[PDB]
DNA sequence: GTCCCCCGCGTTTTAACCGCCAAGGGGATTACTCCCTAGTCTCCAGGCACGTGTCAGATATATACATCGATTAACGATGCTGGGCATA
DNA sequence: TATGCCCAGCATCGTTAATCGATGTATATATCTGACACGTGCCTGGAGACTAGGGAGTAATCCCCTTGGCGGTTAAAACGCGGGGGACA
């Protein structure tokens, strides 16, 4: 709640030497300081004497110290070169790129109208910013959000209008509907077009979904397995009416990719994922349900694997029906916490999208069999029968679509091995370790390709004297993979290719980080240490067509974790990571469909070592490649309110039923009840006129009979008789009754408001649609000025009359709960419940505006 | 910085120590026999692992009843305000 | 023509009644997990039964060791006095 210093944004000078001290930073430089408990849009250039003693001051002292050292490294040092200027100056634009992303929103979480100190109540939005966790979500008023990013406000209103709550979802658990194998594509792909095997896979998932069974999508990496999942979920929600919540577990590295693809292909569905640790959990819990002792405002989310094990009570207390997972190789063993954790969620159908090798161990395939079908089910001689029965037994429940059907638009594939010999350092480090001197088992396998893995190893090679070229010279010649890697790297640099290096050891990545940095090679690492905010900037920087990073380092599990590289084509592997097909899936992050200049792969096989035996063992595990017509009282009243709000409901009834008011009935019954209500209304008005005119005639006869006795002189003039036909006739002219009729128990139903409501709403639909159909925010009236206000505590002009009809045109009459919360009108502090703007007091004003426009 | 409880030291008072002799309880040795143990067999039922089963608590869950919160349609009485009718 | 007089006209205030929805409270039912008792099956580590032998019981004798009593010197414990130096605040 305190207004202290959070972080530092930018820095410059305030008043327009060898080393500026802190005093020069006080009386000579101003710094852009970001305050805590506040958005990044309130950054002010402050120093020390302008704010005084405030909470938090050491951060700016350390930042100013790094700025002093930076100034000592820009032009106040005789040892600086040329690349150091581009690096130190590159950090400036780097921090600017990491700070400008906090000013643009990305999502509006909630929208609660809070009161101020002057008594007014303004609607503030829970703004979510870009490249930031769910924390630090500040409330911003609706007076400047619509003036900066209207797409987030319009989409935020679209999430509330498109009511896809689970209470509207169908319940085909007792009987599945008739399924039809489609061939075309549904009009929901707004991103791009699809081929044939995508729609075939969708027809397979929906083909098996109608039978109450689950399958495994085992296609090739790159055939659009993510798009088929989003299209299958969207088609299942909007087709089979399955708007219920669907949990899709996605790793944290691929979560932003699935968010961008999900919003790019299906923008009509929200994608509120689950990230953070503590406060973000409170954000997801406060956004999950309402503060009451069951308001489902979500459906599709993304949960990381660790977030499942960390939070089992929050996710386990919610019902689910569909489960999707990318890279489902984590379920290799049936004795893990994730395997028993996913089986605890009461779901209905599952779907496994992965390509794990189900041939090296039977517990993997069997684990994937009993994972979705609990109950279903060695020697080399009986293996032909075991796979002869299990093969065709599992074929109807698996998709095996090879890449041979998509090679018509893909470049050729090739791979060349390279048996690299050892050197003298690898000989002494390969023989002298298992003797006497040390200076257990896996350390030899790790040191079978690079000696620099301990401590007493760099000073042993350096037999002379700080130098720089001698260290790198003694570093490249220590192993053959460095000399051959530098020669092949130079050969690829003579033409122009994007080369990748996949390594298992995390220390070798740092060794390459110290070797490639001296040679002037711009690159960026990617392992399991940096957070998503950094690796996402690195990958988004590598995907640029003008990127100068021709080398991009990865890892094994982190390298083949997810996402993809489109501009990469060359994949260099130091050694096999002790896993079959791990190299195929590792090259799958670069060798993809978007690549056009082919793919060249070099495997640095260590000759006469220990990795060739592991490679042979990996080849051994690779050769195996085998009531509807019933309308109750609440339906008559709710339908009557639907007529009072929307009028004619024979054209947008599908939108007036899915809102949650009208139950699931037949449209013909709504049409018949509507025709009977309107017909009985018109007939009741006609009878009301035929009888009312007769009553008026009787009051004219009795009134004349009273006047005949009044003009004679039989009535005293001292007291005027109030009980005469004249008074009851005058009160009959100003009668306080309406055309009422009881329809099927429901009493107090007016017929004039229905006809006049259809006329007013019809004149509004034809008036707005007959002039501005695709731009309702540009409708005008001209010179038609109605009567002024009657003592109102707010300014009201013609613009309020023009924008006031927009809310009635969109939401309808009587829906003042959405008009006061609409930021596209400007009447935020002009609609209340003591006060002048009332509910019916303004509605009758709208009726006066419509009656004024009709005349 | 103060006060009084220990050490050092001379003399007064008790009992430890050494020498001698006595007497008998109790420990040390021995011989014989007889109960109690290790050793050896057979047997299982005691015990170990595990599937199967209804009952403590705990968690909702469809259904019904009672009590408001708040909203909207309806009714009693106008207040200037607008649109026309008899007089300066 | 301007100024008081007749006839509507919506919004001002207040009050009644029907309705959707939230809150509180039962009430019999369908899961959830955690079992402790039983029967399933099997091992044999105990029980059961018998033998054989040598330890330990006891009894009968021995003689060493422990307790006792006594009296003479001769050091030791006991006492006090006095004042210094360590405890304690
Ligand atoms: N239907 C499609 N049409 C065109 N391109 C597609 C389609 N589906 C996927 N892609 C391409 O595939 C890339 C995404 O890869 P993706 O299939 O999501 O990886 P994964 O193997 O994790 O599913 C995108 O860059 C996109 O260009
Ligand atoms: F093969 Be995908 F990129 F997971």
UniProtKB/Swiss-Prot annotation:
The answer, when asked if DNA-binding is one of the entry's keywords, is: yes
Catalytic activity line of the entry: ATP + H2O = ADP + phosphate + H(+)
Location of the protein in the cell: Nucleus
| A GO molecular-function descriptor | chromatin DNA binding
Changes seen on gene knockout:
Decreased sensitivity to the cytotoxic effects of 6-azauracil.
Any GO CC annotation of this UniProt entry? SLIK (SAGA-like) complex
Q: Which residues form the Helicase C-terminal domain?
A: 484-626
Q: What is known of its domains?
A: The 2 chromodomains are involved in the binding to the histone H3 methyllysine at position 4 (H3K4me3). The CHD1 helical C-terminal domain (CHCT) binds DNA and nucleosomes.
Quaternary data: Component of the 1.8 MDa SAGA complex, which consists of at least of TRA1, CHD1, SPT7, TAF5, ADA3, SGF73, SPT20/ADA5, SPT8, TAF12, TAF6, HFI1/ADA1, UBP8, GCN5, ADA2, SPT3, SGF29, TAF10, TAF9, SGF11 and SUS1. TAF5, TAF6, TAF9, TAF19, TAF12 and ADA1 seem to be present in 2 copies. SAGA is built of 5 distinct domains with specialized functions. Domain I (containing TRA1) probably represents the activator interaction surface.
Further comment: Present with 1620 molecules/cell in log phase SD medium.
Q: Could you tell me what this protein does?
A: ATP-dependent chromatin-remodeling factor which functions as substrate recognition component of the transcription regulatory histone acetylation (HAT) complexes SAGA and SLIK. It recognizes H3K4me. SAGA is involved in RNA polymerase II-dependent transcriptional regulation of approximately 10% of yeast genes. At the promoters, SAGA is required for recruitment of the basal transcription machinery.
The similarity comment for this entry is: Belongs to the SNF2/RAD54 helicase family.
What's the protein name? Chromo domain-containing protein 1
Q: What is the lineage of its organism?
A: Eukaryota, Fungi, Dikarya, Ascomycota, Saccharomycotina
The primary gene name is: CHD1
- Summarize which stretch of the complete protein this chain spans: 175 to 1266 of 1468
């Amino acid at each position: 709640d305190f207004h202290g210093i959070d972080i530092v944004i930018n820095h410059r000078l305030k008043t327009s030497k060898t080393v500026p001290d802190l005093n020069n930073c006080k009386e000579n430089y101003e710094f852009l300081i970001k305050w805590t408990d506040e958005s990044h849009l309130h950054n002010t250039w402050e120093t020390y004497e302008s704010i005084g003693q405030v909470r938090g001051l050491k951060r700016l002292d350390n930042y100013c110290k790094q700025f002093i050292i930076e100034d000592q490294q820009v032009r106040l040092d005789p040892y600086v070169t040329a690349e150091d200027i581009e690096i130190m100056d590159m950090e400036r634009e780097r921090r600017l790129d990491e700070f400008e992303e906090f000013h643009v929103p990305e999502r509006i979480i909630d929208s609660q109208r809070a009161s101020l100190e002057d008594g007014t109540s303004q609607l503030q939005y829970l703004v979510k910013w870009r490249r930031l966790n769910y924390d630090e979500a500040t409330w911003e008023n609706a007076t400047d959000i619509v003036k900066l990013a209207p797409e987030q406000v319009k989409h935020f209103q679209n999430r509330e209008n498109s009511k896809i709550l689970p209470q509207y979802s169908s319940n085909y658990t007792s009987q599945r509907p008739r399924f039809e194998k489609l061939s075309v594509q549904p009009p929901f792909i707004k991103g791009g077009e699809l081929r044939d095997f995508q729609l075939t896979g969708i027809n397979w998932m929906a083909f098996l979904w109608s039978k109450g069974d689950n399958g495994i999508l085992a296609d090739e990496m790159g055939l659009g397995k993510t798009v088929q999942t989003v299209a299958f979920i969207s088609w299942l929600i909007f087709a089979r009416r399955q708007n219920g919540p669907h949990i899709i577990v996605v790793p944290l590295s691929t979560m932003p990719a699935w968010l961008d693809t999900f919003e790019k292909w299906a923008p009509d569905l929200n994608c509120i994922c689950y990230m953070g640790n503590q406060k973000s959990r409170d954000t997801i819990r406060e956004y999950e349900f309402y503060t009451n002792p069951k308001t489902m405002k979500f459906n599709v989310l993304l949960t990381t694997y660790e977030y499942i094990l960390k939070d089992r009570a929050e996710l386990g207390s919610i019902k689910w029906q569909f489960m999707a997972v990318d890279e489902a190789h984590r379920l290799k063993n049936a004795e893990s916490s994730l395997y028993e954790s996913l089986n605890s969620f009461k779901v209905a159908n599952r779907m496994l999208i992965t390509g794990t090798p189900l041939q090296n161990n039977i517990k993997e395939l069997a684990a994937l069999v009993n994972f979705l079908m609990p109950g279903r089910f060695n020697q080399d001689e009986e293996q032909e029968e075991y796979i002869h029965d299990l093969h065709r037994r599992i074929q109807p429940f698996i998709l095996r679509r090879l890449k041979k059907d998509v090679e018509k638009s893909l470049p050729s594939k090739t791979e060349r091995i390279l048996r690299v010999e050892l050197s003298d350092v690898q000989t002494e480090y390969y023989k002298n370790i298992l003797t006497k001197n040390y200076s257990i088992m896996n350390e030899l396998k790790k040191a079978s390709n690079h000696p620099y893995l301990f401590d007493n190893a760099e000073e042993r090679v350096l037999q002379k004297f700080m130098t720089r070229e001698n260290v790198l010279r003694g570093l490249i010649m220590s192993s053959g993979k460095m000399v051959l890697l530098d020669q092949l790297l130079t050969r690829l640099k003579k033409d122009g290719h994007r080369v990748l290096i996949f390594s298992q050891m995390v220390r070798m990545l740092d060794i390459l980080g110290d070797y490639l940095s001296i040679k002037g090679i711009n690159f960026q690492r990617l392992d399991g240490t940096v957070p998503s905010a950094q690796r996402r900037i690195s990958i988004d920087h590598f995907n640029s067509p003008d990127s100068n990073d021709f080398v991009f380092l990865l890892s094994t599990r982190a390298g083949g974790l997810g996402i993809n590289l489109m501009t990469a084509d060359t994949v260099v592997i130091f050694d096999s990571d002790w896993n079959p097909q791990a190299d195929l899936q590792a090259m799958a992050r670069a060798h993809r469909i978007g690549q056009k200049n082919h793919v060249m792969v070099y495997r640095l096989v260590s000759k006469d070592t220990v990795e060739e035996e592991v490679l042979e063992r990996a080849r051994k595990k690779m050769i195996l490649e085998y009531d509807m017509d019933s309308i109750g009282e609440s339906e008559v009243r709710a339908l009557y309110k639907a007529i009072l709000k929307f009028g004619n409901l024979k054209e947008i009834l599908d939108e007036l039923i899915a809102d949650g008011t009208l139950p699931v009935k037949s449209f013909e019954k709504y049409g018949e009840t509507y025709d009977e209500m309107m017909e009985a209304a018109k007939d009741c008005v006609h009878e009301e006129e035929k009888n009312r005119k007769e009553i008026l005639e009787k009051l004219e006869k009795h009134a004349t009979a009273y006047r005949a006795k009044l003009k004679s002189g039989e009535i005293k003039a001292e007291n005027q008789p109030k009980d005469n036909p004249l008074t009851r006739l005058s009160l009959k002219k100003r009668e306080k009754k309406a055309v009422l009729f009881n329809f099927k128990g429901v009493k107090s139903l007016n017929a004039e408001s229905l006809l006049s409501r259809v006329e007013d709403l019809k004149y509004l639909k034809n008036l707005i649609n007959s002039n501005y159909k695709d731009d309702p925010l540009k409708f005008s009236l001209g010179n038609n000025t109605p009567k002024p206000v009657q003592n109102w505590s707010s300014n009201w002009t013609k613009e309020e009359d023009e924008k006031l009809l927009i809310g009635v045109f969109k939401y309808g009459y009587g829906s003042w709960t959405q008009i006061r919360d609409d930021p596209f009108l400007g009447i935020t502090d002009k609609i209340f419940l003591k006060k002048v703007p009332g509910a019916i007091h303004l509605g009758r004003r709208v009726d006066y505006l419509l009656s004024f426009l009709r005349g």
